[PDB]
Amino acid sequence: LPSESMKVVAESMGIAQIQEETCQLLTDEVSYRIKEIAQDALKFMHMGKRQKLTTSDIDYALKLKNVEPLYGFHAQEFIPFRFASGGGRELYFYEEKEVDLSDIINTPLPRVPLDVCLKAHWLSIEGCQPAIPENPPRLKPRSIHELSVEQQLYYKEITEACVGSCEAKRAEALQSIATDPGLYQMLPRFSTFISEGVRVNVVQNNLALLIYLMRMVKALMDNPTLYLEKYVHELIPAVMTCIVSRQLCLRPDVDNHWALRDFAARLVAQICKHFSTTTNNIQSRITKTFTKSWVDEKTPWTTRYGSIAGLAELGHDVIKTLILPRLQQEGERIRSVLDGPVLSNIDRIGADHVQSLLLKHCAPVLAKLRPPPDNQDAYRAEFGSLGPLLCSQVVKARAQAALQ
Amino acid sequence: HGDQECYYQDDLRVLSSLTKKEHMKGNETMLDFRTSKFVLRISRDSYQLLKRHLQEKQNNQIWNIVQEHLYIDIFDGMPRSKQQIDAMVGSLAGEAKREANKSKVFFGLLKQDPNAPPQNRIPLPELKDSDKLDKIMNMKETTKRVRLGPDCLPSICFYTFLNAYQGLTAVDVTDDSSLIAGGFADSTVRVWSVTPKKLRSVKQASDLSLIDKESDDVLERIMDEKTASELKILYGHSGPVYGASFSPDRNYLLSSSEDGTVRLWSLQTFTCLVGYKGHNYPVWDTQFSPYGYYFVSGGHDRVARLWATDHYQPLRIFAGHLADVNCTRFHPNSNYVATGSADRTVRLWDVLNGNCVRIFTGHKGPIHSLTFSPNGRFLATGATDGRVLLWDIGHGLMVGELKGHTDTVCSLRFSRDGEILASGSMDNTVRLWDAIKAFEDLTATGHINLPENSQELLLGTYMTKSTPVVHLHFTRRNLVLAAGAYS
Amino acid sequence: NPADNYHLARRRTLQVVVSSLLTEAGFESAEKASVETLTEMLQSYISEIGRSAKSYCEHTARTQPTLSDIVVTLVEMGFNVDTLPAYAKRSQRMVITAPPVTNQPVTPKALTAGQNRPHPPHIPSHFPEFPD
Amino acid sequence: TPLVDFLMQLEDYTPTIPDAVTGYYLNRAGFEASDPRIIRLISLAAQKFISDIANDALQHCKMKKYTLTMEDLTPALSEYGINVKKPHY
Amino acid sequence: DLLADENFLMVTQLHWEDDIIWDGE
Amino acid sequence: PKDAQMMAQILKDMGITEYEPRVINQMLEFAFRYVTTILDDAKIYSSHAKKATVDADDVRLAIQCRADQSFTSPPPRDFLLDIARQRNQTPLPLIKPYSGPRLPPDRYCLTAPNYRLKSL
């Protein structure tokens, strides 16, 4: 240790005018005791099998050398505090050095973790390591398929379970897709089965077939082992079709699910724009297709509602800028559905869903950038769509923020 | 200090702190280094050049330091190659004399074997009818025992400790794979049943007084069903429990810890019975005898004690090491105790007379694992250099070095037949070595010429998911068990 | 992180205890280093009656400590035990809540049920089944 | 015997320190929770020790209230024979 | 950097939006 | 910091690559505790010798009178080898064949009726 730190300590104690040989005598004695303890604290690190040298190793190394592990305070009578340590304090250099005494009481205590249990598994089966989650990772000859027959049978069982005849079968197959480590090298056949399926499954609008395939896409995405952005060029136009397509079946009975089909598709769409991101290829391409779906005149209202759902779930900054200028076209579309008597078509249902989603999204956008003053009739400057009900939604959001 | 060998780097930094006299007067390791003699095994072809440079009076003072502080043990040999000298050096007082490794060692098993000791040499306990009932069901397991070899590689069943936020410091498994003990840093021992049979305590003394003995099933009528768990926690150590050892009759758990006591826990009442206070210092290991009466405990005070579960004081003190006795292992005949240590030596100790009969040097780090061959003829040792050195016991000359592991090899075991040595380290790997092709060849020179058979002796590596392999166990049907505490 | 929450669930419970004991006929808004000092003396005090009352009972060949082992333990720390019935009956006495449990769901896993393969005769039935 | 009559009145009276926290630091030292009233006396004896220091550091703060400092803990623990240390870093 | 493998993956080089079935009939 | 960056070099010179962040903070807390008990005893020894300046012989006295009490060591090799040969000369005792659970005398074991208070 440096001697110019030992003279600062001495003159801040009342011992002034110390010589350099007196001061060098202090810094070779205490630097030996640090070296004697750190060599002795490495014994507790090597028998604790942790190669870490935690803060408690010096507490036992001090107690071994008959020195109290008491730090920051030394009791000359020893009777109140013996060789038991006080685990020091939580330290940071960047601390506040003054807290309020009721701030420490009102904070929630951390959760005591689970107790130690003994689980057994298999490192090796007769020499081979299994891929369980407890483990880390002139005629030309007749060729063999690159899948095994156990793997091909597994693919057949998982695909016949993922078409959702039974719900428990689906859910396991979805978890099996979500965490099989060896599901690479089978992934082309899964991507092709998804893509091909949606395209011949929108020829007749079979909603379950589609809701099961979208859940299969979601189960494919959250698997951490497999490399997906080689196959996302097949995955993205499948989800795009699910959100922006018309429904060939009866829309009114399942339009509630249809909103969820567009709900699940817009979730996985913004999750795909969150991952796999490079410069100006994926997110901007689907944003441009969503905007030209919106600005297109005389749309199908199923497509229009799907395009709205897609443009709505894109995050914080997207919605505010995109909706701002449109504050009139949406209202005019709602007014046309209202005026024309035609009720047996799906136009009225599409209009109500679109208006509710646009209004609900507007409430956070308004709650997010501006105070909640004049929540009664100022929204009449924005054609009076949600008005006081929008203000009530903003108030509910403020109450949720207060609860947080 | 700069022109020293690279494996002395942790030794010199303790010396850089030592600059005063009173700093060294309370170290007690350099105090014993200053009074002992470095052994320094050299050949007679090189000693003639050394003594022709020291007997002259031109130097006359470095020769005085040599003949005061250094022993020199001379042996006759062809000169060893640099990679053969590198295999058998690395210890303070290194490369001990051949006159230490020439004593007669009874390395054979008990019951003719001429290398076997008599049954009345060490007073071993009787074999009871419940202990004779154990060996009847033990040979039913031996019927299903597979011959492992280099072809039928064994299956490894890893018993990982999942949460383990108190640090797991000690594992032991019973000889039949029925119990698994865990020594933890929160000063607890935790017994787990791995068979589908919950851990029961015996009934209280009021309940045993109303039942009768004799009968025919009193080993079942006394077990309390009110107390039946898959886990029993044992409290009473005031420190992290470093050793854990079962008795061969599946009672009598042993545990040693930082507080300097060895504790004998019952497995019928699940309480503590005795606290053996002989060390004032952390007892780093303990093990029962394979016959279950004696036990050896090695601690920080550089001795290993021999206890008997009947005396509060030890019977033998094995006091020749210069650093901490890290490991203590009994021979399969329990007449000999191998104690690895932190001064890079492994020493066999006769239970009679307490004499060191073998000194095995050649490790570069502190020895953290020892195991014996089931023949009793060989001894595998592992240390922090990642080297598994296979020693003979009747000869005591090494050269067979298994050097596949990277970090500290903390667990070794041979197979039940002896066909495979399993090694587990902090590299999170369970390596399997061919323990038949390693001893196939097996003096007047003290060495057998080092080969590089490590690549040929590897059968598999078996990387583990972030989990240091603390224990390795072989089921009696030759199935590898391992326990790790996933980090 | 549930690893450091093994220690911080009980040390930050002792921080609420000292913050509740320095408010009873006393302070508000204490210094930060003065709270981690006093809760370090509190943990070192519970750990010292743990080690010494276990030592006094095990000296008398017992395993669990009675009342007579703690009233000799507190005497050897200089406590004056007789003042403790008056301290327990305060009107300012408060109770600090115990810390929450990490496994709030307890059993939230549907699991993956797959069975194939049996056991060779060197593996008993109580070891885990061979996987798919 | 007052202290036996006192401990028999501790099936009620949750103290200031919880028994899940007092019992944690007792289990760390080998003391196991046989009787929960035994924990509440140790939790009361550890409260009274900290309370006697904070009540005597208040007298060393009135001469120089409203803030507990290290220069108030220093003369308060000096009659106890405990030399407290300033971090000085 | 324009020779990076991703540039050539056909998700970043194909107008796959045109595929999404818009009111198929 | 100044003195905390030298503490990370004392550990790295001892080969300690991995350590907790609270390890440096409490070795500095021990090093501060050790120098304020050498220098506290140094001015006690200076007032004994009646000199107004605490010079280097006072710190030489306060180091070697604190190292004579605080930092002890295990037993020496000439002490361990004398108590070994005094103990290893005694022959091993024979074992009674059916004594039961082999234990020390009951005043050396931890097996007592182990009472507790009646709840009332």
Annotate B18-39 with b (16+ C-beta within 10 A) or e (fewer): eebeebbebbbbebbbeeeeeb
Give the domain extent around B16: 1-100
**For residue C99, which phi and psi values (nearest 5 degrees)?**
-70, 155
Sign (positive or negative) of CA dihedral A377, A382, A385, A389: negative
Q: Do chains C and E touch (3 or more CB pairs under 8 A)?
A: no
Task: Give Dmax over CA atoms of chain E in angstroms.
Answer: 43
| Experimental approach | cryo-EM
CA distance A43 to chain B (A): 10
Inter-chain contact F109–C66, Cβ cutoff 8 Å?
Answer: no
D29: chain B residues, CB-CB within 8 Å: 238
Residue B409 backbone zone (phi > 0: left; psi -120 to 50: alpha; other: beta): beta
> Locate tokens 């093994």: which residue?
C6
Of C55, C63, C126, the CB nearest to B194: C126
Q: Compute CA distances F2 → B17, B260, F13, whole Å.
A: 21, 39, 17
> Locate tokens 């006295």: which residue?
F61
Residues of A (164-203) whose Cβ lies below 8 Å from C: 171-172, 175-176, 179
**For residue A377, which phi and psi values (nearest 5 degrees)?**
-135, 5
Distance CA B353, CA B335 (A): 11
CA B270 to chain centre: 26
B315: chain F residues, CB-CB within 8 Å: 92
CA distance A401 to chain C (A): 23
User: Considering only CA atoms, which of E3, E1, E6, E7 is closest in space to residue A227?
Assistant: E6
> Locate tokens 């004594």: which residue?
F99
Distance CA F88, CA B110 (A): 25
Distance CA C84, CA D3 (A): 9
In this complex, is the C-beta atom of E22 within 8 Å of any C-beta atom belonging to chain A? Answer: yes
Q: Are E17 and A237 in contact (CB under 8 A)?
A: yes
Inter-chain contact A245–E19, Cβ cutoff 8 Å?
Answer: no
In this complex, is the C-beta atom of D29 within 8 Å of any C-beta atom belonging to chain B? Answer: yes
Q: Which residue of B has its CA nearest to C65?
A: B236
Q: Which residue of A has its CA nearest to E10?
A: A233
In this complex, is the C-beta atom of C131 within 8 Å of any C-beta atom belonging to chain B? Answer: no
Distance CA A208, CA A170 (A): 12
In this complex, is the C-beta atom of A74 within 8 Å of any C-beta atom belonging to chain D? Answer: yes
In this complex, is the C-beta atom of F92 within 8 Å of any C-beta atom belonging to chain D? Answer: no
What are the boundaries of each domain within chain F?
Answer: 1-120
Inter-chain contact D51–C87, Cβ cutoff 8 Å?
Answer: yes
CATH code, domain with B16: 2.130.10.10
Distance CA A269, CA A207 (A): 18
A135: chain B residues, CB-CB within 8 Å: 464-465
Q: Are B421 and B410 in contact (CB under 8 A)?
A: no
Size of interface A-D (CB pairs under 8 A): 30
Distance CA A349, CA A338 (A): 11
CA B291 to chain centre: 17
User: Considering only CA atoms, which of A63, A86, B186 is closest in space to residue C47?
Assistant: A86
Of D34, D35, D89, the CB nearest to F28: D89
Classify strands B295-299 and B304-307 as parallel, antiparallel or unpaired: antiparallel
C77: chain A residues, CB-CB within 8 Å: 79-80
In this complex, is the C-beta atom of D55 within 8 Å of any C-beta atom belonging to chain C? Answer: yes
Structure tokens at A263: 């709900």
Distance CA D80, CA D75 (A): 9
Distance CA B202, CA B204 (A): 7
How are the residues of chain D apportioned to helix, strand and coil, as percentages rounded to the nearest 5?
55, 5, 45
Q: C20 CB contacts (<8 Å, ≥6 apart)?
A: A105, C94, C96, D16
Distance CA A68, CA F29 (A): 12
> Locate tokens 């039974």: which residue?
A166
Inter-chain contact D45–C18, Cβ cutoff 8 Å?
Answer: no
Distance CA A110, CA C98 (A): 10
Structure tokens at C30: 């204490």
How are the residues of chain B apportioned to helix, strand and coil, as percentages rounded to the nearest 5?
15, 30, 55
Q: Compute CA distances B124 → A143, B92, B295, B331, B353, whole Å.
A: 67, 36, 12, 13, 16
Q: Spell out which chain D residues touch chain A, with contact meaning CB-CB distance below 8 angstroms.
A: 77, 80-88
